[PDB]
Every structure is written in C-alpha cells, then in structure tokens.
C-alpha cells in the first residue's frame, strides 16, 4: 500500500486565465525569431533575390506583425463575445477583417 494520491487536473479555463494574466503582464516576442526570419526571406524571394535583410528590419517586421495579430484577436474576441460564444471561429476572423476594411 505505497500508492500516491493524484492532484487531478484543473478545470478548462483556469490555466487559460492564468496564462492570460502572465502573457498580458510580460512583453517579450511570442513568435520564434528564426522561423519568422525564414518566412520573411521566403516572401521576399518572390520579387528579387540577393536582398539582404538587416536584423533591425526583421525585428521591426516582427513587432508590427505581432501588434497586428494581437489587435485582430482582440477584435475577434469582441465578435465572439457578441455572438454569445467564448470560442473564436474563422467566421469571426473574416467578419472582423470585413468590418475593418482589410477584406473587400
């Protein structure tokens, strides 16, 4: 009789609300640097090659992309809350982009 009682698991949302507070308190970059750099180089390859990209340009691009995605998710969260749901769906993403004017 040497067994161990388990602490079980948290409810869905508790660890979500914790990590919400933790990420809204801290300010570091959330996208990994090297995959983002490779993605930027892949997009830039399609126009004209042999194009060097300074580290500061990649960092500025990363900051702008993170700010855009965070704003889009805030708007999509407002859309989901409006439809009496707590889960965001692609239809809310499309609607947010539609009302923002980004999608024609």
């Amino acid at each position: 009789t040497g067994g161990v009682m388990k602490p079980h698991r948290y409810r869905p949302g508790t660890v979500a609300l914790r990590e919400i507070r933790r990420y809204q308190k801290s300010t570091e970059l959330l996208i990994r640097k090297l995959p983002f750099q490779r993605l930027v180089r892949e997009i830039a390859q399609d126009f004209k090659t042999d194009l060097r990209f300074q580290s500061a340009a990649i960092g500025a691009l990363q900051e702008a992309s993170e700010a855009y995605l965070v704003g889009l998710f805030e708007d999509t969260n407002l859309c989901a809350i409006h439809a009496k749901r707590v889960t965001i769906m692609p239809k809310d993403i499309q609607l947010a982009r539609r009302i923002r004017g980004e999608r024609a």
Partner: protein
C-alpha cells in the same frame, strides 16, 4: 460514535504548516520567482463595525481567488487581512475524528459547511522522488496498510505518515463530498481540501484519492457507495499480471496476454483465483495453457531455469510437452550446453523415484519424457557425462520393472547412447 480526536492526534507529530526537505522543493512556477507577483485589483472593503477587511470574498470578483491563487499582504491592492488568505490564516473548518466500522479513523464535519468552502489544508513533509521511494520501501517493509503520500507536482510529493494534519484521516469515497485542489500561496504551492457540495453536521468528509499505485497491489474499497468500483486505483489490475514467475511463464510459452486471459475469463466471472504468490502452483492454468515449439535460445535458457527452479509436476509435464513440440536442432544444442539432461534427471527423480502422484500418471509422464530424449541429436557421451542420467534411467527401470514399455524404451535409449564415444579432454599436470 465516540470522539477520537486526541487519540488520533497522539499517533503522529502535529504540524501547523508544511515542512520542506529543502528550500528548492515546493516553489511555485518551478522555482521561477515571479517578481511581478499577481496583485488583485480589489479595493479593500473595511466593515467599520467589525473592523474586518471584506475584500476578495466568495461573491467578489477577485481574479486571484478565481485562479486559485492566494493574496499576499503587502503586495496586493486588497490590503491586509483580505478574505482570500484562508491557507495563511489557517481558518480551518471545524472537524472531529470518529472510529469507522472498517476504515479506521475518519473525519466528520462538526458544523454545516457551505458549497466551495475551504475545509482543511493537507499537511505533510515536502519530499523529492528519491526520498519518496526510500520512505515507500521502508513503509512497505513495515507493512503499513494506509496511504500517506500525495503528489504535490512532478517529482515532488507530500508525506503524511509521521508528521502532518487531520486531513490524513480523510477516507476515500467513490462518490465523494469533498475534493483536493492545488493553490498558489506566494511563491509556494499548497494542497487544500474544499467542500464539493453542501455538507451537514456529523457527516463524514471524504475525497477521491485517484491512487497511483506505482505497481502496488490493488486494495479493496469498502466506502459503501453504490457507484463503487470495488478497488482503489484507476488501474485495472486484479491478478491479470502474473500467475507464475516471468522466466517460468515464458518457458511455458505464456506471456502477459496469456496470463491476462485466464484471470479475465474466470475471476471476472465468479471463479476463484488466489492473490499473486508463486509458492503455490495453480495446475488448472498450466493445463489450460497453449503450447508452441521453441525456436529461440533465450527461451531455452528460460526453460532450463524453470527446470532448475519449479518443483511442480504439472509445469514440468507441460514444459516437456512443449519440448516434444520443439524440433529446432540449435535450441536442442543450446539445451545440451545448458545441460538439460542434468535437469531432466532431477525432474525424473522427483516424480518416478519420489512418489507424490499415481503410478499410471507417472507412467504417462515417463512415456512423455523418454521421447525427446530419444529424439535429440547426440554425438558423444561427454554430453551425458555432465549428468550421468543413465544411472537415473537404470534406477527408474528397476523400480518400475512391471511397466515393460518404459523398460524397453530405456533399453533402446541406453543402447543408442552406449554407441557414442567420449570426447577427448586433454590431461592436465598434477
């Protein structure tokens, strides 16, 4: 039932707080000090009559309370003595200890307790995994029939055996009225016990253990709940793990699946199979086992180990039958290297010289064991000289002289073996 509170308390060293094996264990965020500690935005609500800070109450919107984190004085906007300092202020629910019919001491509510209310902080010594293993082995040697370990987190356990609180006396219920939860107090982790529903005075306080046995045997559950599974542990075990020792079981061709199948077919259908113990061989399992020829030398080594270990007549019968099915010459050469004849001499002697069985059945055994001896490849009496099994054959043909087929088969066998030469062995200086 009579109160046993002081008697239960005298059995162990009472603790007011959790003790730590070292300062590194039990720290929140795996020890990563969150210097920006989570401060609730609650405004302090001081009742001027009672002078009590009502902030961070049950129906208040304290984020920390919802996220199972306790406010720390001097860090939160709620001020000191808020209503979310239940662990630190040690404001336990009133409880008593009473002797149960079968479970020993148990905890009962001295007062009616509201839903989601904090009952009591589980107390103990915070220990690492190696210390847990050492203490577990020591307690199993001591024969203790009670769990006193809970998993604080991965690699970090809490022991309630020698030191702790009243919470160690809470008994398992398969439909429990209370539950254990994990909370964060400052940079530390606590394990509390909270009320899952409305509980009245006098009712026993129980929680689901969710036992991780770590290979320990199942313990029957006597909670009395209608939804009881009958055993402690979300780990279907019963006796479908081993019926015979692993080398002996694999010698018979049995594996984990074949040892599972027999117990699943009978024990779950109201037929008795004893608790795991290899001192007594269950002959019915060995008879019902399926037999397939051996083609692996490690299996032959396991067979030789089973011959050297098992004393049962029926296991040896089925191993010899499996050898009869076996016809791979390389496995037989390995058995010769393992000196299978030496083991077969003792197997004969125990059955047809010592008489624990019936003469007809022993005759059937002897006819079933002479055949592969006649069949195996042999090239030199050096093989036999490592066993001198011929002497045993002479003794058993002389004892059972009335059974003439055995005598004639042993005649043919010794005639065949006597034709073989002896392998030359270089003499050594003396």
């Amino acid at each position: 039932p009579a109160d046993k509170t002081e008697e239960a308390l005298t059995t162990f060293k009472t603790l007011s707080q959790n003790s730590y094996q070292n300062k590194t264990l039990g720290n929140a965020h795996n020890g990563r000090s969150t210097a920006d500690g989570m401060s609730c935005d609650c405004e302090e609500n001081w009742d001027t009559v009672s002078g009590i800070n009502n902030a961070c109450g049950e129906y208040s919107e304290c984020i920390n309370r919802l996220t199972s984190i306790e406010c720390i004085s001097g860090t939160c906007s709620c001020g000191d003595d808020c209503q979310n300092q239940r662990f630190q202020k040690k404001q336990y629910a009133p409880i008593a200890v009473f002797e149960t019919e079968k479970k020993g001491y148990g905890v009962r509510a001295q007062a009616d307790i509201r839903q989601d209310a904090f009952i009591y902080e589980y107390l103990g010594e915070v220990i690492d995994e190696s210390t847990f293993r050492k203490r577990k082995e020591n307690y199993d040697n001591q024969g203790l029939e009670h769990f006193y370990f809970m998993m604080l987190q991965k690699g970090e356990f809490i022991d309630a055996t020698a030191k702790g609180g009243l919470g160690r006396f809470c008994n398992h219920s398969c439909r429990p009225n209370a539950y254990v939860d994990k909370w964060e107090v400052g940079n530390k982790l606590r394990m509390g016990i909270f009320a899952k529903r409305e509980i009245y005075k006098g009712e026993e306080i129980c929680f689901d253990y969710n036992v991780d046995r770590y290979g320990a045997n199942p313990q029957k559950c006597y909670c009395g709940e209608d939804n009881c599974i009958g055993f402690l542990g979300g780990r279907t075990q019963t006796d479908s793990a081993n019926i015979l020792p692993v080398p002996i079981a694999e010698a018979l061709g049995s594996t984990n699946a074949q040892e599972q199948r027999w117990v699943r077919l009978m024990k779950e259908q109201n037929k008795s199979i004893k608790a795991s113990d290899y001192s007594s061989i269950n002959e019915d399992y060995v008879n019902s086992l399926e037999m397939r020829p051996i083609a692996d030398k490690d299996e032959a080594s396991k067979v030789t180990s089973a011959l050297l270990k098992t004393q049962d007549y029926i296991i040896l019968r089925k191993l010899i039958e499996r050898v009869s099915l076996t016809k791979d010459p390389e496995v037989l050469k390995e058995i010769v290297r393992l000196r299978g004849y030496q083991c077969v001499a003792n197997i004969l002697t125990m059955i047809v010289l010592d008489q624990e069985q019936q003469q007809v059945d022993v005759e059937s055994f002897t006819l079933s064991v002479l055949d592969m001896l006649e069949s195996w490849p042999n090239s030199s009496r050096n093989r036999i000289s490592s066993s001198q099994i011929e002497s045993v054959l002479e003794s058993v043909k002389t004892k059972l002289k009335k059974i003439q087929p055995i005598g004639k088969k042993i005649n043919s066998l010794l005639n065949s073996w006597s034709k073989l030469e002896i392998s030359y062995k270089i003499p050594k200086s003396q």
